[PDB]
Amino acid sequence: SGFRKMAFPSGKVEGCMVQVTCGTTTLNGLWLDDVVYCPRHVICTSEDMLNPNYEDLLIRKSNHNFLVQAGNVQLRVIGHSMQNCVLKLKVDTANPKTPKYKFVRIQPGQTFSVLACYNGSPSGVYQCAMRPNFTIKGSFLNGSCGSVGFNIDYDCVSFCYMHHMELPTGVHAGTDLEGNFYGPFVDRQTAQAAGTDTTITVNVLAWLYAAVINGDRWFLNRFTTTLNDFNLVAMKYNYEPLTQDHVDILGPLSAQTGIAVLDMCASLKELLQNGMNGRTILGSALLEDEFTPFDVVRQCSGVT
Amino acid sequence: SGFRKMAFPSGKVEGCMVQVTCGTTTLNGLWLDDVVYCPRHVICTSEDMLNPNYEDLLIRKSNHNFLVQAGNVQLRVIGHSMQNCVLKLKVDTANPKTPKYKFVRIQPGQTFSVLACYNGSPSGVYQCAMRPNFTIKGSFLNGSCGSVGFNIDYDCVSFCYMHHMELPTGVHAGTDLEGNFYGPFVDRQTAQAAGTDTTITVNVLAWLYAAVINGDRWFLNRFTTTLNDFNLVAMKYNYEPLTQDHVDILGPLSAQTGIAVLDMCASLKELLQNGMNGRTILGSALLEDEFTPFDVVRQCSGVT
Ligand SMILES: O=C(Nc1ccc(N(Cc2ccsc2)C(=O)Cn2nnc3ccccc32)cc1)C1CC1
Ligand SMILES: O=C(Nc1ccc(N(Cc2ccsc2)C(=O)Cn2nnc3ccccc32)cc1)C1CC1
């Protein structure tokens, strides 16, 4: 028992991190097979971030201008190309530590682990959620760009995120591994405000089921609700509207605990209306929304 | 910016996890050089956990009774010995993935990452603190025993914890890598209650400095306090008494922010007395105590 914000073991990803330097700028790259993936803003100078013309900036760069170092060994760059907001540096050596992998574009509300890196070296790993407003609340300092987000299914690493920027609000924006930004963000040093950060209702419910499984049950009540009644309350508290698809994914947790999804919704409704009253749930004094129903099942069953 | 409960990259530890089976029981072992370390209760049956005589139980076991598998390859056991509550299985092959390592016995209040494993395979990584009552609030299911806690300094892995048991209260107990239990716990299926779980005051203060660095400052006040005045309040709220050594370790954070340690203590005092008033600090509605002053500095500087 016990419930923790658990990240995937990062070893398979650590073996892919490299350092990419272009002129004065150094950031992280992801080396898979004979390609190194990195944010295209690696080619930008101080007077560029303001309004960069990446096509015009990339014209002044050749294969030899991109310095890729893996550990203490230099990789030879034989090709370079821009795909949306990422650069793909073709190297002459396939990464011998390349795991089985996929590039996936995750849905808002889904979770992933981030391996924060600096100068191609890993510093830490933590679990994140893609917010409904397509930002992530990460922990990144200058030099962390190119750090990636991922999920792992047995031996396959699904890369879903690459870190590119920090908005003036301290939240983070980035792309999938095809270089497409999550949300409306652009790789430009401009005021870009994130939209309303709504709570991932399906995840809070999954976490409430995790709490019941692990012994925290004070919040269980004698009430029930309907999807429409619950959604009226969810709207007021800037919670995502719950759908029948959400109810369906909560099915295994509902079956395991014997608490119908709508009864758990009624517990959530009362917690939203009345607060925690100074109490805690799984060591938290607020409703946790960064565990999907899949994460709860995985952690409560021990999937390796 | 941003602040997260970050764990160390687990790759160096993943390469050490093996599966150890003795009779019907399977748990995790740690393979470093030519030795596999695992909890000695791997030799116990159902009618043993109640009151096991490990010396008498180990007498009926030979090198061939301990099955050690690393991935899909079997290791040959050429020696076995019991050191306190761990078994040391000498194997004929040095682990080719053995990192530079140390065995350290951590102090209560210090933090570490846990690589949770099942059948020698890693499932996840999370950050823990050794509670002042020598328990850890982990996430472990049956089969997780032998999972280890560790810290990493550049390339050196300091192993500090090995998981052995879950107390009837859902908290976890374990040993250092010499097999000595943290706290008064014994590897026996008996009621063993943990003592009072006090809050790690030096860590809450370090987290409050992390909050100021990352922009959360509503809790800063116009007051100050003394060590004795603060400790009167800390006693009432089951917080660890703050010492001059604690003040000294908070020194770099105090210097970075320009907020004297005793002024931060006065903010903590008011938060203890008046609560959060429905507000949050670094996305938490309670005072976080599982970040040491070293963790805050490391995360806020980007040590890899
Ligand atoms: O100034 C340089 N580069 C350089 C500067 C800023 C950035 N930007 C914005 C940007 C994006 C596309 S263009 C400009 C970031 O937000 C990067 N970021 N991400 N997480 C951060 C956390 C803290 C601080 C910065 C962080 C990206 C690149 C060269 C070294 C001289
Ligand atoms: O029953 C067997 N072994 C077997 C049973 C219990 C245990 N024990 C207590 C114990 C310790 C020394 S003696 C008995 C644990 O607390 C292990 N633990 N740790 N985390 C857990 C989280 C959830 C459940 C159990 C957990 C250790 C070993 C053999 C497979 C048949």
> Chain B residue with minimal CA distance to A15?
B11
Q: Do A11 and B6 touch (CB under 8 A)?
A: no
> Closest to B5 (Cβ–Cβ): which among A126, A137, A298?
A126
- Helices and strands, counts by H and E, chain A: 9, 13
Any idea where the domains of chain A sit in the sequence?
Answer: 1-14+100-197, 15-99, 198-301
Distance CA(B216)–CA(B276), nearest Å, equals 13
CB atoms within 10 A of CB B93: 14
Ligand 2 mean position to B142 CA, how many Å? 6
The pair of structure tokens assigned to B30 is 């740690």
Give me the resolution in angstroms, 1 decimal. Answer: 1.8
Phi/psi region, residue B183 (left: phi>0; alpha: psi -120 to 50; beta: rest), is left
Distance CA(B18)–CA(A92), nearest Å, equals 35
Backbone angles phi, psi at A152, to 5 degrees: -130, 125
The pair of structure tokens assigned to B183 is 């706290």
> Closest to B118 (Cβ–Cβ): which among A140, A172, A302?
A302
> Chain B residue with minimal CA distance to A280?
B286
Q: Which of A21, A47, A145 to mutate to test the pocket of ligand 1 (most atoms within 8 A of CB)?
A: A145
Distance CA(A118)–CA(A139), nearest Å, equals 12
Distance CA(B287)–CA(B17), nearest Å, equals 34
Q: Do A115 and B9 touch (CB under 8 A)?
A: yes
- Which amino acid is located at B169 in the chain? T
Backbone angles phi, psi at B67, to 5 degrees: -95, 115
Sign of torsion, CA B9 B13 B15 B18? negative
Sign of torsion, CA A82 A83 A86 A87? negative
CB atoms within 10 A of CB A39: 26
| Ligand with smallest separation from the Cα of A191 | 1
CB atoms within 10 A of CB B295: 24
Atom of ligand 1 nearest to the CA of A26: 30
Superfamily in which the B1-14+100-197 domain is placed by CATH:
Trypsin-like serine proteases (2.40.10.10)
Is A55 exposed, middle or buried (CB count within 10 Å of its CB: 0-12, 13-18, 19+)? exposed
Q: Is residue A112 within 8 Å of residue A149, measured between CB atoms?
A: yes
Q: Where are the beta strands (DSSP E) in chain A?
A: 17-22, 25-32, 35-39, 66-70, 73-75, 77-83, 86-91, 100-103, 111-118, 121-129, 148-153, 156-166, 172-175
CB atoms within 10 A of CB A23: 14
Cα torsion A45, A51, A54, A55 to 10°: value is -130
The pair of structure tokens assigned to B269 is 């005092």
Q: Which CATH class is domain B15-99?
A: mainly beta
Q: Is residue A202 within 8 Å of residue A292, measured between CB atoms?
A: yes
Which technique was used to obtain these atomic coordinates?
A: X-ray
- Domain B15-99 and domain B198-301, same fold? Reply is no
- Which amino acid is located at A231 in the chain? N
Distance CA(A160)–CA(A42), nearest Å, equals 20
| Ligand with smallest separation from the Cα of A146 | 1
Q: Is residue A268 within 8 Å of residue A183, measured between CB atoms?
A: no
- Nearest one of A95, A179, A151 to A163, comparing CA atoms: A179
- Nearest one of B161, B169, B35, B187 to B98, comparing CA atoms: B35
Catalytic residue among A16, A22, A38, A41: A41
With a CB cutoff of 8 Å and minimum separation 6, the contacts of B207 are B281, B282, B287, B288, B289, B291, B296
Sign of torsion, CA B175 B180 B184 B186? positive
User: Domain B198-301 falls in which CATH fold?
Assistant: main proteinase (3clpro) structure, domain 3 (1.10.1840)
Ligand 2 mean position to B124 CA, how many Å? 19
The pair of structure tokens assigned to B298 is 């490391």
Q: Whose CA is nearest to atom 25 of ligand 2?
A: B142
End-to-end CA distance of chain A, in Å?
16
Q: Are strands B156-166 and B172-175 parallel, antiparallel or unpaired?
A: antiparallel
Q: Is residue B125 within 8 Å of residue B72, measured between CB atoms?
A: no
Distance CA(A272)–CA(A284), nearest Å, equals 15
Q: Is residue B12 within 8 Å of residue B113, measured between CB atoms?
A: no
The pair of structure tokens assigned to B40 is 């000695």
